[PDB]
Amino acid sequence: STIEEQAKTFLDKFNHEAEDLFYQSSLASWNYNTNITEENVQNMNNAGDKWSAFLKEQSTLAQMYPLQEIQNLTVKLQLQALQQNGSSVLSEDKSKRLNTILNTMSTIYSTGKVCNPDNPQECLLLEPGLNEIMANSLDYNERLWAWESWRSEVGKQLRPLYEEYVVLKNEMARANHYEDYGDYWRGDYEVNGVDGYDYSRGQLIEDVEHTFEEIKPLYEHLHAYVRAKLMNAYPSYISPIGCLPAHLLGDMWGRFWTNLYSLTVPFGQKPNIDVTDAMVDQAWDAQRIFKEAEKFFVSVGLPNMTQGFWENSMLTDPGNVQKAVCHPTAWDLGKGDFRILMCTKVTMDDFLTAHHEMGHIQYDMAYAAQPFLLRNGANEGFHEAVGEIMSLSAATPKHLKSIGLLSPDFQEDNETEINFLLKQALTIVGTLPFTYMLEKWRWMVFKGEIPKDQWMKKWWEMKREIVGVVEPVPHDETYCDPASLFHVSNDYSFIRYYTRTLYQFQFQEALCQAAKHEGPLHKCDISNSTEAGQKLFNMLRLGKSEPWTLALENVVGAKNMNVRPLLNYFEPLFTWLKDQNKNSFVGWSTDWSPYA
Amino acid sequence: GGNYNYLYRLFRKSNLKPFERDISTEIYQAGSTPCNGVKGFNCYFPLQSYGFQPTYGVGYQPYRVVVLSFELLHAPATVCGPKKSTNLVKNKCVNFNF
């Protein structure tokens, strides 16, 4: 008989129970986070696995449906989302050991302990402390010692676990008809629907290389400038012919270069824009911050947050034994419940964090009309892009001036704009090559092109070739540097942090295009521009209902993820660097080493 | 904790007629295979209970609805309302509607 018409009844039956079950589970998790106490633990757990106990049969029941002839795009998409069996494709004896090995790597990576040889009774962890040892310090011996200790006492035991984790994950992918698990990560970034918007899993590999060669000159110039500043700070330790070490970047893995901003200040006479003291003088509390964050969203055209968010959600000051987590998060519990979990203070960083959380919350309610299974973004890089857009547009000095927070008689010039631009670049453009390198290495080690013995040497060689960083100490095959990272052993995709950035400026540019502004991209604001409210909403009101290839068409001119505005956002910085590093050779040579 | 005492019909072969109330609890059969009063491969329960909670947003809260439908059969009218009247003024030539 017919199968297409009887799948709708099953979909509705599943969704009706899933809505309130997920609502109750999320409410239990929210209660546990808001109240850090034993009473709210078991119940939360009593929900969690219970949802899993409900997610299997609905996945188990999604095998009798031959999803190869249903002509309804939305119904087919929902059935395909429900048809993924997950980890229920391998044998139980291997599944239990995979779960055990995942648990043990999660526990071991979070309990790294390194003791100084001179004082063997003082071991530290990834918690601030050992992190603070090199987070803010001007030294070469202690930073290198901490790096070596971390990569020898946390980078050694994770390697054998990762060795079997790779093969088991690849075999699971093969059981899921994936030749490699990179395809599993690239399944979401792929659509097989309307003609003309088709995308393939293998297209991402070539397209990312296509979109990475246009920023190489700017990254080389910034690398040369950072190297020259390091020479001015660390004499006779960084070779002009070579490049900078890994521990001197500012982070143990080079993910962020913010720690090196103080050592690479172009013009120290002009201070950075700070109005925190002004906020204190103006008596700005958490409520004032939260209501000022609302004006920016409502001046573009976005609706107002409904009643209950100010009441049900925790806002500030957990205070006494009623402990709550201060990590800023936005929770969409469903059935019209949206909440924020953050600790507010008087800080422009806190203002930007509140704006980011409001952007996430607005994006979440934007696709609220979608069913339970479709209230998700097209890709992982859309939520963060939307959140960062409002932080970008609220960092303009014009916005602070217009909201009565900066002096109307301000005399901002090119020097302070360049300083803020470089401060921003040390965080945004300085992490794209490292994320690229990590994702590429993970994909190529999951593909099995290299043997088991060619693991560390190739990783380090590509680090010198792409990032332009040499080895602080020689590394043998028994070590494992990638395993000493959060998103390498927790099964988290790392390309998520890359494409989003490629969108952000793009979106901003398009939003700037819909801003009636002339001049630099960084200065233009989406505030006081209602026309951009609906256009952005076109991507907000879709979510998973439409493919990302189709989604990237109502705001930006081209659906391709070509990184055009990156070279123009830092245009004053680029033309200043062209007039700065004339006497320093740009690039790096992969023969010089700190150890020899 | 979720008020599950309010139920709504979710599955039925055909729609309701105007001013019709159906309280049938037969196991709906979306597919072709008959079920002997049990759920299964294509059989589901027509009635589903709500999970209303005070934390539910606007549009998901419980809402009491009363519909007053007037009938005007040829029998003499019985439901007639406001009989607003004026004051009694006498000793003046006036028109009246007692």
Side-chain angles (χ1 to χ4, degrees):
Chain A
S1 64
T2 185
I3 314 293
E4 195 269 333
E5 284 92 39
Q6 70 179 357
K8 287 156 184 136
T9 73
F10 162 71
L11 276 166
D12 295 354
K13 177 61 171 161
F14 162 65
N15 290 332
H16 170 82
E17 316 200 51
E19 275 175 23
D20 68 6
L21 201 58
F22 179 71
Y23 174 85
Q24 288 186 299
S25 169
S26 304
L27 189 56
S29 294
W30 170 269
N31 276 324
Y32 169 58
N33 269 318
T34 309
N35 198 356
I36 305 170
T37 181
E38 51 91 22
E39 209 281 327
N40 297 115
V41 175
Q42 299 91 0
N43 309 351
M44 183 278 288
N45 287 119
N46 284 359
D49 54 5
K50 187 175 44 85
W51 161 253
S52 197
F54 168 74
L55 202 49
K56 57 189 303 213
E57 295 104 10
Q58 310 290 320
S59 165
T60 305
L61 264 74
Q63 267 80 245
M64 284 73 74
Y65 296 112
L67 191 63
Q68 46 257 28
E69 62 256 5
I70 296 173
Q71 308 302 326
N72 216 341
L73 267 296
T74 287
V75 175
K76 185 205 275 156
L77 194 151
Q78 294 179 357
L79 196 42
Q80 171 175 127
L82 273 172
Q83 262 197 338
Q84 286 194 356
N85 279 310
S87 67
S88 67
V89 73
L90 292 189
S91 296
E92 273 305 322
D93 47 31
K94 315 220 286 191
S95 169
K96 60 168 68 68
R97 71 183 296 274
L98 187 54
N99 295 125
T100 317
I101 202 172
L102 264 291
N103 298 317
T104 191
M105 42 185 98
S106 159
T107 52
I108 286 173
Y109 165 67
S110 75
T111 50
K113 279 178 63 180
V114 295
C115 277
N116 217 305
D118 59 353
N119 189 240
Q121 287 70 240
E122 199 266 333
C123 275
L124 293 164
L125 286 89
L126 206 58
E127 189 197 301
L130 171 66
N131 200 37
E132 181 56 40
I133 285 297
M134 61 76 88
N136 197 343
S137 69
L138 194 145
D139 276 325
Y140 189 78
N141 314 112
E142 67 159 343
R143 281 174 154 243
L144 172 61
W145 152 80
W147 205 78
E148 178 55 39
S149 67
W150 184 255
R151 261 154 159 96
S152 65
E153 266 80 8
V154 186
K156 180 64 69 68
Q157 72 272 16
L158 276 296
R159 163 74 187 277
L161 276 67
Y162 182 67
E163 184 184 4
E164 294 89 59
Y165 172 67
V166 162
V167 64
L168 207 52
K169 192 61 82 168
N170 197 36
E171 190 171 1
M172 185 180 288
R174 291 183 183 178
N176 293 121
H177 295 285
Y178 282 132
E179 71 173 2
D180 283 312
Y181 184 71
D183 291 331
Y184 196 95
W185 291 352
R186 296 189 294 269
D188 48 352
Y189 289 81
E190 180 204 56
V191 61
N192 320 118
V194 187
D195 49 353
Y197 287 156
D198 209 316
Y199 203 82
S200 52
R201 287 180 299 269
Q203 187 159 341
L204 194 71
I205 300 173
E206 58 91 31
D207 188 77
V208 167
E209 292 174 354
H210 195 315
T211 194
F212 185 64
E213 294 176 355
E214 284 85 5
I215 76 168
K216 186 160 277 195
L218 172 58
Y219 186 77
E220 275 168 18
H221 272 7
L222 263 176
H223 186 293
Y225 178 74
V226 165
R227 209 185 49 228
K229 271 279 201 303
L230 283 177
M231 291 145 198
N232 280 342
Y234 288 165
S236 83
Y237 263 76
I238 305 105
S239 52
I241 312 167
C243 57
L244 73 165
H247 41 58
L248 299 187
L249 286 156
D251 281 328
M252 280 145 190
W253 303 270
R255 219 182 159 204
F256 286 121
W257 298 7
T258 306
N259 294 312
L260 209 63
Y261 171 67
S262 300
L263 272 79
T264 65
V265 180
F267 303 135
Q269 287 69 240
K270 301 294 186 291
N272 286 320
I273 305 308
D274 185 41
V275 289
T276 303
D277 185 76
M279 288 156 96
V280 172
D281 282 331
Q282 292 185 3
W284 280 36
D285 58 346
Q287 185 98 343
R288 181 64 171 282
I289 293 187
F290 270 83
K291 71 177 70 175
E292 286 260 14
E294 182 197 274
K295 292 193 288 184
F296 193 84
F297 283 76
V298 304
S299 80
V300 193
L302 292 170
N304 195 358
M305 71 215 88
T306 60
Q307 183 209 347
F309 159 78
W310 301 115
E311 303 174 352
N312 308 122
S313 84
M314 43 156 288
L315 275 165
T316 318
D317 202 3
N320 56 4
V321 191
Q322 174 55 263
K323 301 308 200 310
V325 178
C326 279
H327 190 49
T329 49
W331 289 70
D332 185 5
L333 312 185
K335 302 247 164 175
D337 200 354
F338 320 100
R339 286 181 216 207
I340 197 177
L341 184 135
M342 61 79 71
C343 293
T344 315
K345 292 184 180 293
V346 180
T347 309
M348 201 35 78
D349 303 331
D350 282 321
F351 200 72
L352 298 175
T353 312
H355 269 253
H356 197 111
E357 297 308 309
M358 295 296 172
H360 273 285
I361 283 284
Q362 260 289 307
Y363 191 73
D364 282 334
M365 312 157 278
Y367 49 66
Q370 304 288 336
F372 170 67
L373 293 174
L374 304 191
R375 290 179 202 149
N376 286 114
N379 52 6
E380 291 91 2
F382 277 172
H383 295 265
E384 285 296 323
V386 163
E388 291 255 1
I389 280 159
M390 301 265 188
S391 303
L392 272 177
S393 184
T396 63
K398 171 197 309 303
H399 171 78
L400 292 188
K401 196 181 75 175
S402 83
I403 63 176
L405 194 54
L406 262 180
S407 66
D409 307 337
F410 212 71
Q411 54 268 28
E412 70 266 29
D413 46 350
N414 44 32
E415 297 178 357
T416 177
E417 292 299 328
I418 289 169
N419 197 359
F420 162 74
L421 204 59
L422 182 66
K423 183 174 174 65
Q424 183 178 2
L426 280 169
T427 316
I428 292 168
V429 70
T431 190
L432 298 186
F434 175 62
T435 290
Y436 176 75
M437 182 196 138
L438 176 61
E439 192 67 23
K440 200 176 165 53
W441 183 91
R442 208 144 63 165
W443 280 339
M444 61 79 71
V445 73
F446 281 161
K447 197 170 283 185
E449 294 170 351
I450 49 172
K452 297 164 71 173
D453 296 331
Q454 190 94 340
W455 266 26
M456 291 335 307
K457 307 299 188 293
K458 261 287 183 65
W459 158 274
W460 276 115
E461 200 46 59
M462 311 205 288
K463 187 170 177 67
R464 311 166 70 130
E465 185 61 273
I466 304 162
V467 193
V469 171
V470 298
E471 298 83 1
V473 296
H475 287 281
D476 46 349
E477 207 262 330
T478 198
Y479 289 163
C480 196
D481 307 312
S484 68
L485 195 42
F486 195 79
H487 307 262
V488 175
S489 63
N490 311 344
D491 210 0
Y492 274 63
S493 64
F494 213 71
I495 205 55
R496 162 200 300 107
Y497 303 113
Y498 194 88
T499 65
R500 60 162 181 81
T501 307
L502 260 60
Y503 295 151
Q504 288 180 5
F505 302 95
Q506 280 185 237
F507 291 170
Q508 167 85 334
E509 182 209 6
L511 269 71
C512 200
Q513 188 85 4
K516 196 260 289 180
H517 188 273
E518 298 89 359
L521 184 52
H522 71 263
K523 201 73 169 66
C524 75
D525 197 339
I526 70 172
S527 181
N528 282 320
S529 180
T530 316
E531 49 266 7
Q534 207 50 49
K535 182 181 273 299
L536 171 63
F537 200 76
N538 277 341
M539 293 180 183
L540 310 196
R541 66 162 272 268
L542 286 190
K544 212 203 284 182
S545 181
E546 305 291 352
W548 67 277
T549 46
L550 166 62
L552 297 174
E553 273 288 87
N554 303 320
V555 181
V556 295
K559 71 194 77 65
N560 192 3
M561 63 205 157
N562 58 316
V563 56
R564 171 62 260 170
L566 190 151
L567 308 186
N568 303 329
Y569 192 90
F570 316 101
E571 191 72 34
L573 187 68
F574 183 75
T575 198
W576 184 75
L577 287 172
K578 276 172 141 170
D579 220 336
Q580 277 291 318
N581 53 24
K582 193 62 62 190
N583 47 5
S584 64
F585 287 86
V586 296
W588 50 84
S589 163
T590 62
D591 54 354
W592 178 89
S593 59
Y595 45 86
Chain B
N3 196 356
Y4 287 96
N5 284 311
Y6 279 111
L7 278 82
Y8 72 96
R9 187 175 309 280
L10 188 51
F11 296 128
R12 185 176 178 179
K13 297 182 287 185
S14 296
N15 296 13
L16 271 293
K17 268 79 176 174
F19 305 125
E20 187 188 11
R21 186 209 281 100
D22 193 1
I23 58 172
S24 171
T25 63
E26 183 195 7
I27 307 303
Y28 187 76
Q29 178 206 300
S32 85
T33 62
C35 303
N36 46 6
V38 291
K39 66 171 71 42
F41 188 66
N42 296 115
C43 285
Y44 295 100
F45 208 62
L47 297 173
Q48 304 285 296
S49 56
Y50 280 138
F52 289 145
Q53 277 174 66
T55 52
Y56 275 19
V58 181
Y60 279 80
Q61 275 170 4
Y63 271 71
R64 286 179 167 205
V65 185
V66 179
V67 180
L68 284 186
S69 169
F70 317 112
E71 168 184 26
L72 197 63
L73 192 147
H74 72 83
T78 80
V79 188
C80 307
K83 301 298 282 174
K84 300 289 95 175
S85 173
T86 69
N87 288 319
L88 191 153
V89 285
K90 48 173 99 188
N91 306 94
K92 281 169 47 58
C93 169
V94 292
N95 53 3
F96 48 79
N97 193 357
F98 281 167

